[PDB]
């Protein structure tokens, strides 16, 4: 990985020692990317609704995941399950558990850093995995991609500005999400989000990550090419926000 410091150091050493499950999934890879550009063509908002107990960005629930998922699966393009256990308070179980339990495509979402950790999410029967380009080295991020593509997964490559977009696109990333919240000072910035979407080729099936969010700010990213919405918060918080995002 690369050295890093403060909170992000620790999440990458704990990930670097994760053990790694034994399991087979219940069905074959339904892509997630795919699916997303189908709802495109049918003008159907795309949202993949986040289950997370924690952030460092300040939330802190509980809500019981079958019961969450259940209820996005009727609006939802897709779940993204957060696995990370110190500082989303996630776990390997809560994605099992979520992707026997409905039909559409599921997202691991972690800070993975070795190859085990995709066999993890693949044995549990996500549908894909997110890559995140500032915790790897250039070599690492193109062989974990390789990785990931090797089990029919295409992964959510996640950048935060310019110098980890020129990393994505080298490495051919098709799949890209886009952050709203900047690694290096802790704050929202959505200027930032809306530039780095404009550089994006539109081959690239593009994905803006949120906390909160609200009708008009979807509305006007996806005039921007934007094809769909990693939305955590508003939707822990509120889950039938969805329904209003989307209609
Ligand atoms: C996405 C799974 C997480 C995300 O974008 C995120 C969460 C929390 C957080 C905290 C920061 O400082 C405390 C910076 C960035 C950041 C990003």
């Given at each position: 990985?690369?050295?890093?410091?403060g909170?992000?150091?620790?999440?990458?050493?704990?990930?670097?020692?994760?053990?790694?499950?034994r399991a087979?999934?219940?069905?074959?890879?339904?892509?997630?990317?795919?699916?997303?550009?189908?709802?495109?063509?049918?003008?159907i908002?795309?949202?993949?609704?986040?289950?997370?107990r924690?952030?460092?960005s300040?939330?802190?629930?509980?809500?019981?995941?079958?019961?969450?998922?259940?209820?996005?699966?009727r609006?939802a393009?897709?779940?993204?399950?957060?696995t990370?256990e110190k500082?989303?308070?996630?776990?390997?179980?809560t994605?099992?558990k979520?992707?026997s339990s409905?039909?559409?495509?599921?997202?691991?979402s972690?800070?993975?850093?070795?190859?085990?950790?995709?066999?993890?999410?693949?044995?549990?029967?996500?549908?894909?995995?997110?890559?995140?380009?500032?915790?790897?080295?250039?070599?690492e991020?193109?062989?974990?991609?390789?990785?990931a593509?090797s089990?029919?997964?295409?992964?959510?490559?996640?950048?935060?500005?310019?110098?980890?977009?020129?990393?994505a696109?080298?490495?051919?990333?098709?799949?890209?999400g886009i952050?709203?919240?900047?690694?290096?000072?802790?704050?929202?910035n959505?200027?930032n989000?809306?530039?780095?979407?404009?550089?994006?080729?539109?081959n690239v099936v593009?994905?803006?990550?949120?906390?909160?969010?609200?009708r008009?700010?979807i509305?006007e990213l996806?005039?921007l090419?934007?094809?769909?919405?990693?939305?955590?918060?508003?939707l822990?918080?509120?889950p039938?926000?969805?329904?209003?995002?989307?209609?």
């Open positions: 990985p690369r050295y890093l410091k909170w992000l150091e620790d999440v990458v050493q704990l990930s670097l020692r994760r053990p790694s499950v087979s999934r219940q069905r074959p890879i339904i892509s997630l990317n795919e699916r997303i550009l189908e709802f495109n063509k049918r003008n908002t795309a949202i993949i609704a986040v289950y997370e924690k952030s460092p300040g939330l802190d629930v509980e809500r019981d995941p079958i019961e969450y998922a259940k209820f996005m699966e609006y393009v897709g779940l993204s399950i957060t990370e500082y989303f308070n996630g776990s390997y179980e994605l099992r979520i992707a409905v039909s559409i495509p599921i997202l691991m972690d800070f993975i850093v070795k190859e085990s950790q995709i066999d993890d999410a693949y044995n549990l029967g996500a549908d894909t995995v997110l890559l995140i380009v500032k915790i790897l080295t250039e070599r991020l193109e062989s974990l991609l390789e990785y593509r089990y029919g997964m295409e992964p959510l490559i996640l950048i935060n500005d310019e110098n980890d977009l020129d990393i696109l080298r490495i051919g990333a098709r799949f890209i952050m709203s919240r900047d690694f290096e000072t802790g704050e929202i959505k200027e989000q809306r530039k780095l979407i404009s550089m994006i080729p539109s593009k994905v803006a990550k949120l906390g909160i969010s609200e008009n700010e509305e996806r005039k090419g934007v094809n769909a919405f990693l939305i955590s918060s508003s822990m918080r509120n039938e926000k969805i329904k209003e995002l989307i209609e």
